[PDB]
């Protein structure tokens, strides 16, 4: 099926995948703040990646800088909120990434929303997303 992620989910999903990979590696091996994020990522990548994966490295810093919801709990709340709208995954993903202040802005930036939801409901959603915004 179509699985589109918003930036914050992508961040959690990639980090989790690499943390587990680091663990898998350790088990097999022969025995014997947001700034600390950027540092941790470099270490995580060094330990789990082919060293020359700049695409992934660039992606990680990007996601650390643009992820609006930082913890799984909040992200989980955001996904629940958006799915209960019945919107298409491509719209849910953008809506979960692009912070928007008004219905007009969101509808203008995501034209397919035009006639799938009313301004009032969308306004109510923007408020909820905003309220879930990590203040960290």
């Amino acid at each position: 099926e179509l699985i589109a992620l918003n930036l914050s989910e992508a961040r959690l999903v990639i980090k989790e995948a690499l943390v587990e990979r680091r663990r898998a590696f350790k088990r097999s091996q022969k025995k014997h703040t947001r700034e600390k994020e950027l540092e941790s990522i470099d270490v995580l990548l060094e330990q789990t990646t082919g060293g020359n994966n700049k695409d992934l490295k660039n992606t990680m810093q990007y996601l650390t800088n643009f992820s609006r919801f930082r913890d799984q709990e909040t992200v989980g709340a955001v996904i629940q909120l958006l799915k209960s709208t019945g919107l298409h995954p491509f719209e849910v993903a953008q809506l979960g990434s692009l912070a928007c202040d008004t219905a007009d802005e969101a509808k203008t930036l995501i034209p397919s929303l035009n006639n799938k939801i009313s301004d009032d409901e969308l306004e109510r959603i923007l408020k909820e997303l905003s309220n879930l915004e990590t203040l960290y």
Binding site: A4, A10, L18, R21, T49, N52, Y62
Partner: protein, 160 residues
Amino acid sequence: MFFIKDLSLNITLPSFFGPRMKQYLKTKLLEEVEGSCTGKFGYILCVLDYDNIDIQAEFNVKYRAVVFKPFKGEVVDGTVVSCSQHGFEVQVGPMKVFVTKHLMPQDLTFNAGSNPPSYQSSEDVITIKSRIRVKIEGCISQVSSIHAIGSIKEDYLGAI
């Protein structure tokens, strides 16, 4: 856009048969696909769920990965990494979106005298490290790479 996609890869190995050849295959899978890119379906950024990668001479390896692929009309936020007379690049995930000078408001003009290089108007100053919302006007897909051209002309685009 970021997606999680079900992908597949056929790998061939009789010199390495063993009780733990499965870890070896997972290793070649990462080397061959992670960090790769095709105009077809984008950047295969990160193979997921390492412990349960499904492996079935040659073996069909079914796995999942976080993938990134831009699309025309998609609005995204990013960081300016360079400016020139021709325009500026915006880092968006693993990709650089190039906004041409012709896809910017006419009042925005290159300041060939500033450092770092920048574009400016009566209010905004777009330069290196600036956060910006752009619209992907076009994607050019090559065999092993994707190119995006963007704009900040329309409403709600530009400096964040």
